[PDB]
Curated annotation (Swiss-Prot):
It is found in: Cytoplasm; Endoplasmic reticulum; Nucleus. The gene is CRABP2. Forms a beta-barrel structure that accommodates hydrophobic ligands in its interior. Sumoylated in response to retinoic acid binding, sumoylation is critical for dissociation from ER and subsequent nuclear translocation. Gene3D superfamilies: 2.40.128.20. It comes from Homo sapiens. Interacts with RXR and RARA. Interacts with importin alpha. Disulfide bonds: none annotated. One of its GO terms (biological process) is regulation of DNA-templated transcription. This is Cellular retinoic acid-binding protein 2. It comes from the Eukaryota.
Length: 138
């Protein structure tokens, strides 16, 4: 049953720095982050339109819980709290618009997609900037 359910390890991370640049993260941190980001692991437990996603690195880990179509709360990538809401684009592509609780700043989004060759593809937008990360089953 080829659904999002599984354990994924990152294999590619195009443009991560630029996203963080755009979110106003200073150089030194951006680089410390980019190094961190080679050990991204995503565990996904998916039943119907309901999603458990654990996202860990070597030292940090978060679990978000969501049903598609139901507004929920998470943080951006730069870790600002936001109102998020996911919708399907197709059989195995969902996309999430984030709107900031407090504060002002860039237009953040994220999508998860399963390719027909069994990779997980995460894209994360902030304004004009698009970061892509590809994961494979652990």
């Amino acid at each position: 049953m080829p659904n999002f359910s599984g354990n994924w390890k990152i294999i590619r991370s195009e443009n991560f720095e630029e996203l963080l640049k755009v979110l106003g993260v200073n150089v030194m941190l951006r680089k410390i982050a980019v190094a961190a980001a080679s050990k991204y692991a995503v565990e996904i437990k998916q039943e119907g339109d309901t999603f458990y996603i654990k996202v860990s690195t070597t030292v940090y880990t978060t679990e978000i819980n969501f049903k598609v179509g139901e507004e929920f709360e998470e943080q951006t990538v730069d870790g600002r709290p936001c109102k998020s809401l996911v919708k399907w684009e197709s059989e195995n592509k969902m996309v999430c618009e984030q709107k900031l609780l407090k504060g002002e700043g860039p237009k953040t989004s994220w999508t998860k997609e399963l390719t027909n060759d069994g990779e997980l593809i995460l894209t994360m937008t902030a304004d004009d900037v698009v970061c892509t990360q590809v994961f494979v089953r652990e």
